[PDB]
Amino acid sequence: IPTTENLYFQGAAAHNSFGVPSSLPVDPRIDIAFLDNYARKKWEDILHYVVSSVPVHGGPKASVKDLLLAGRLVERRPDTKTGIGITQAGFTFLLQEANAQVWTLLLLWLEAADQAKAAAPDSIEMLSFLFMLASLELGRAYDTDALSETRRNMLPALVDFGLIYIPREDTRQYFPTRLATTLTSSAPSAHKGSIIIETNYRLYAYTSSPLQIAVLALFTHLNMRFAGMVTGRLTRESIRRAISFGITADQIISYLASHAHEQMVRAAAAAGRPVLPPTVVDQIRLWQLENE
């Protein structure tokens, strides 16, 4: 009998508390354009911290750093200068779209409270607040006074996820970002076509169409993953297979560079380093010249 829309509407109406709009005047400089930039800057920091753990050779709050660590997205390493190392889930997280990344962090946030509850704000209270936020209007100011004490205690973790914006000047108002409004919506991709090349010759990529799967298979040891995702390792055999298809090392390097991950390019450009690892790029050319 009941569909997805029926169960959602039932869970949303289940709790009588809803978003009260602030009767107080709104600062003109807090527009939909500002809130989009704010939410973007919050997530760019989270993503930069994840990109920081990628092997080569001022950060988000403890509320974010710990959830990524406990969520096995980034493992603790006692050898690195940064003291952290990226996992398989970490690279998957990087290729995920904006909405999916928020739900990775949200579901882990819900999981952390129940684990702290079992050892002794619970899941029911947290979910109900997320359900309310999804029904809010983007750009509109809402009364913080109207929120319950438990819901008020959730705001610092929710601002850390770039879902809510509370001005330093007026704590009486809370602004939901585009991430809050569109949270449970859809009832122009961000990382489709991207390729991630590691220092250990490993590949992580989200193919645009099966044409890219066929293209990557010419020079990489592929293995199909969920949706358009593919994973593999660059070997002498795979690189020399490309030679038999008329693909040169120069064409391989130029393809991996042009199709590189947005955030990984950003971190490389901000430092004094090229996107693709130089050690790998030299080995791509060597294998193509290693013939008889």
Residue numbers in the entry: 109 to 165, 176 to 238, 254 to 320, 331 to 435
Paper text:
XPB is part of the general transcription factor IIH (TFIIH), which is functionally divided into core TFIIH and the CAK complex. The model shows that ctp52 is organized into four distinct domains, an N-terminal domain (NTD; aa 1–120), two middle domains (MD1; aa 121–319 and MD2; aa 350–454), and a C-terminal domain (CTD; aa 455–514), that interacts with p8 (40).
The second structure encompasses the C-terminal part starting at amino acid 121 (ctp52_121–514) and was solved in complex with ctp8 at a resolution of 2.7 Å. In the latter structure a 28 amino acid long linker region of ctp52 (amino acids (aa) 322–349), that is not present in human p52, was replaced by a short linker (sequence SNGNG). The linker region that was replaced in ctp52_121–514, bridges MD1 with MD2 and could not be observed in our structure due to its flexibility. The ctp52_1–321 model comprises the NTD and MD1 domains and the ctp52_121–514 model the MD1, MD2, and CTD domains. While the antiparallel β-sheet of MD2 (β-strands 8–11) is pointing towards MD1 and is involved in the formation of the dimer interface in our ctp52_121–514/ctp8 structure, it is pointing towards the N-terminal extension (NTE) of XPB in the TFIIH model. However, after the rearrangement of the individual ctp52 domains according to the model of human p52/p8 embedded in TFIIH an overall rsmd of 1.6 Å was obtained, indicating a high degree of structural similarity. Our crystal structures of ctp52 show that p52 is a flexible protein that requires its binding partners XPB and p8 to assume a complete functional state.
